[PDB]
């Protein structure tokens, strides 16, 4: 008498292809074949596939298969047991168990865990905070070519963290990291070039490692790059490729990057003049803590009509919801 508005409706109606499968479950068997026959290596795999299922399940058996894997000296298993150990995932937390895991790991050449090592040094998390111990650890894992490790050392000599400052060791070793693709290397490389501290400002330096960062989907980058192109810094002035960048970064949410990118609508920089858009990302801006972007939005409203300034404030919706970091 009304259940005629029962029938299935397409999307949750339609034959069933190739699509609808999953490997999941046969990937699980094939390691768990190998596994279960004492191979370290599928060990190794098995236990990072429970890893990323995300459940509490998973790393209870992620737990179990590193496990497996340390018991035959294997330093990914090591180093395995000293992560969950230490963040108390599949297991109860306990610094000082992660530790011994982890040494035994780094002794094995594992970058990583000497990494996490220097961390808890650096951070004073489980053992006393020692900045001297923290960088010796750091330099192992460097060494051992770990862009996150040459990153750290990159920030510490850069600010004198435990060391004196000395921004040229800091940029190599921010480069070695950059080198190796790691976007807030690239990005701290390229401000040490944009700032001039290294001796003289290399603002081509500065815009190629800011691109490299960008391209990378780094929203500082982008920001810095767009403005790069604004002032035709290391680059040739281009409005439209600042635009590009801008609205690159302003799609992350970025509240400084927004409220720019309301001034190039505004102003008609690179772009056409658009209030309804100009509007639209100060409004994104002013909820993404951009303080300075409820004058901008405020002072718009003057010149705008109701339909316009409706329409602005929809977008402006829009763009704070559909724009996150
Ligand atoms: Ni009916
Ligand atoms: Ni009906």
Not at 21 to 47: C, F, I, M, P, R
Not at 108 to 134: H, M, R
Not at 254 to 280: C, E, F, M, S, W
Request: charged share 20%; glycine share 10%.
């Amino acid at each position: 008498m009304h259940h005629h508005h029962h029938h299935s409706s397409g999307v949750d109606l339609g034959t069933e292809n190739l699509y609808f499968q999953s490997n999941a479950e046969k990937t699980e068997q094939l390691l768990l074949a190998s596994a279960n026959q004492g191979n370290v290596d599928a060990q190794v795999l098995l236990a990072g596939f429970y890893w990323y299922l995300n459940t509490p399940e998973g790393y209870k058996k992620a737990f179990e298969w590193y496990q497996k894997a340390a018991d035959q000296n294997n330093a990914d298993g090591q180093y395995g047991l000293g992560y969950m150990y230490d963040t108390g995932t599949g297991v109860p937390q306990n610094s000082d168990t992660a530790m011994v895991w982890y040494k035994k790991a780094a002794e094995q050449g594992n970058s990583n865990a000497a990494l996490a090592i220097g961390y808890n040094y650096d951070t004073g998390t489980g053992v006393k905070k020692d900045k001297t111990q923290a960088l010796n650890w750091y330099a192992k894992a460097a060494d051992l070519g770990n862009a996150s490790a040459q990153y750290n050392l990159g920030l510490m000599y850069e600010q004198g963290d435990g060391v004196p400052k000395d921004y040229q060791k800091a940029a190599e070793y921010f480069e070695k990291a950059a080198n190796q693709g790691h976007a807030k290397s690239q990005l701290e490389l390229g401000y040490l070039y944009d700032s001039g501290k290294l001796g003289k400002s290399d603002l081509q330096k500065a815009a190629f490692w800011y691109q490299k960062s960008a391209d990378l989907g780094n929203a500082n980058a982008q920001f810095n790059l767009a403005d790069m192109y604004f002032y035709g810094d290391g680059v040739g002035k281009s409005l439209e490729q600042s635009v590009y960048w801008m609205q690159k970064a302003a799609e992350q949410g970025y509240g400084k990057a927004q409220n720019q990118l309301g001034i190039y609508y505004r102003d008609g920089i690179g772009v056409a003049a658009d209030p309804v858009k100009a509007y639209a990302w100060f409004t994104a801006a002013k909820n993404n803590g951009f303080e300075k972007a409820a004058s901008n939005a405020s002072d718009l409203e003057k010149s705008m009509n109701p339909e316009d300034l409706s329409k602005a404030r929809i977008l402006g919706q829009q763009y704070t919801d559909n724009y996150k970091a």
